[PDB]
């Protein structure tokens, strides 16, 4: 049906909108994940420098 | 002639539905029954071009 096909296209467009919204939400949350994950790297750097310093001492 | 057709074509596309409802354009038309196949072939040319 013509109306059925138009509704199908609208539903597909809604699915695409949901997909892009989910991707945007992923980006927004990965921003906070970026904020937090730096702790692991700074801890690794601190531990490496401590090991080197103690070995030298 | 180039600019006049271009103007006419854009003014015609104005009459068609827009992305407010779907990324794919919707067109409504009157056509004689016998020329439907010819119109489809014209659409095929449009797709190829």
GROMACS .gro file of C-alpha atoms in nm:
model
  106
    1UNK     CA    1   0.000   0.000   0.000
    2UNK     CA    2   0.108   0.360  -0.058
    3UNK     CA    3   0.028   0.466   0.298
    4UNK     CA    4   0.187   0.144   0.424
    5UNK     CA    5   0.508   0.222   0.235
    6UNK     CA    6   0.509   0.582   0.358
    7UNK     CA    7   0.471   0.457   0.716
    8UNK     CA    8   0.750   0.205   0.656
    9UNK     CA    9   0.980   0.483   0.535
   10UNK     CA   10   0.887   0.694   0.838
   11UNK     CA   11   0.960   0.402   1.072
   12UNK     CA   12   1.296   0.344   0.903
   13UNK     CA   13   1.377   0.714   0.945
   14UNK     CA   14   1.283   0.686   1.313
   15UNK     CA   15   1.517   0.388   1.343
   16UNK     CA   16   1.797   0.591   1.185
   17UNK     CA   17   1.725   0.877   1.426
   18UNK     CA   18   1.745   0.632   1.716
   19UNK     CA   19   2.076   0.498   1.582
   20UNK     CA   20   2.232   0.843   1.558
   21UNK     CA   21   2.096   0.934   1.902
   22UNK     CA   22   2.251   0.620   2.049
   23UNK     CA   23   2.584   0.706   1.888
   24UNK     CA   24   2.565   1.060   2.030
   25UNK     CA   25   2.487   0.919   2.375
   26UNK     CA   26   2.785   0.686   2.341
   27UNK     CA   27   3.005   0.987   2.262
   28UNK     CA   28   2.867   1.184   2.557
   29UNK     CA   29   2.930   0.900   2.802
   30UNK     CA   30   3.272   0.819   2.658
   31UNK     CA   31   3.364   1.180   2.734
   32UNK     CA   32   3.322   1.104   3.105
   33UNK     CA   33   3.497   0.771   3.052
   34UNK     CA   34   3.789   0.970   2.909
   35UNK     CA   35   3.783   1.195   3.215
   36UNK     CA   36   3.801   0.895   3.449
   37UNK     CA   37   4.034   0.653   3.268
   38UNK     CA   38   4.330   0.892   3.287
   39UNK     CA   39   4.368   0.776   3.648
   40UNK     CA   40   4.498   0.437   3.533
   41UNK     CA   41   4.760   0.594   3.306
   42UNK     CA   42   4.877   0.843   3.568
   43UNK     CA   43   4.904   0.560   3.822
   44UNK     CA   44   5.109   0.359   3.572
   45UNK     CA   45   5.339   0.656   3.516
   46UNK     CA   46   5.379   0.714   3.890
   47UNK     CA   47   5.456   0.348   3.956
   48UNK     CA   48   5.710   0.331   3.673
   49UNK     CA   49   5.889   0.644   3.793
   50UNK     CA   50   5.887   0.514   4.151
   51UNK     CA   51   6.041   0.185   4.040
   52UNK     CA   52   6.312   0.367   3.845
   53UNK     CA   53   6.381   0.607   4.134
   54UNK     CA   54   6.409   0.328   4.391
   55UNK     CA   55   6.631   0.121   4.161
   56UNK     CA   56   6.864   0.418   4.110
   57UNK     CA   57   6.873   0.491   4.483
   58UNK     CA   58   1.713   2.817  -2.160
   59UNK     CA   59   1.951   2.660  -1.908
   60UNK     CA   60   1.863   2.901  -1.629
   61UNK     CA   61   1.490   2.896  -1.708
   62UNK     CA   62   1.474   2.513  -1.689
   63UNK     CA   63   1.682   2.515  -1.370
   64UNK     CA   64   1.440   2.763  -1.213
   65UNK     CA   65   1.140   2.559  -1.327
   66UNK     CA   66   1.284   2.232  -1.195
   67UNK     CA   67   1.361   2.380  -0.853
   68UNK     CA   68   1.017   2.542  -0.834
   69UNK     CA   69   0.868   2.201  -0.914
   70UNK     CA   70   1.072   2.027  -0.644
   71UNK     CA   71   0.928   2.288  -0.408
   72UNK     CA   72   0.589   2.125  -0.464
   73UNK     CA   73   0.722   1.788  -0.344
   74UNK     CA   74   0.747   1.670   0.015
   75UNK     CA   75   1.068   1.754   0.199
   76UNK     CA   76   1.290   1.605   0.470
   77UNK     CA   77   1.032   1.716   0.729
   78UNK     CA   78   0.885   1.368   0.672
   79UNK     CA   79   1.151   1.158   0.498
   80UNK     CA   80   1.499   1.193   0.350
   81UNK     CA   81   1.364   1.046   0.025
   82UNK     CA   82   1.154   1.286  -0.180
   83UNK     CA   83   0.784   1.209  -0.228
   84UNK     CA   84   0.618   1.316  -0.554
   85UNK     CA   85   0.250   1.306  -0.652
   86UNK     CA   86   0.155   1.320  -1.018
   87UNK     CA   87  -0.117   1.270  -1.274
   88UNK     CA   88  -0.016   1.046  -1.562
   89UNK     CA   89  -0.192   0.870  -1.849
   90UNK     CA   90  -0.196   0.495  -1.799
   91UNK     CA   91  -0.013   0.415  -2.123
   92UNK     CA   92   0.286   0.638  -2.042
   93UNK     CA   93   0.365   0.479  -1.703
   94UNK     CA   94   0.632   0.254  -1.854
   95UNK     CA   95   0.785   0.551  -2.037
   96UNK     CA   96   0.792   0.748  -1.712
   97UNK     CA   97   0.963   0.456  -1.538
   98UNK     CA   98   1.222   0.446  -1.817
   99UNK     CA   99   1.275   0.820  -1.774
  100UNK     CA  100   1.329   0.760  -1.402
  101UNK     CA  101   1.583   0.494  -1.497
  102UNK     CA  102   1.768   0.753  -1.706
  103UNK     CA  103   1.758   0.988  -1.409
  104UNK     CA  104   1.903   0.724  -1.178
  105UNK     CA  105   2.182   0.642  -1.423
  106UNK     CA  106   2.271   1.009  -1.475
   0.00000   0.00000   0.00000
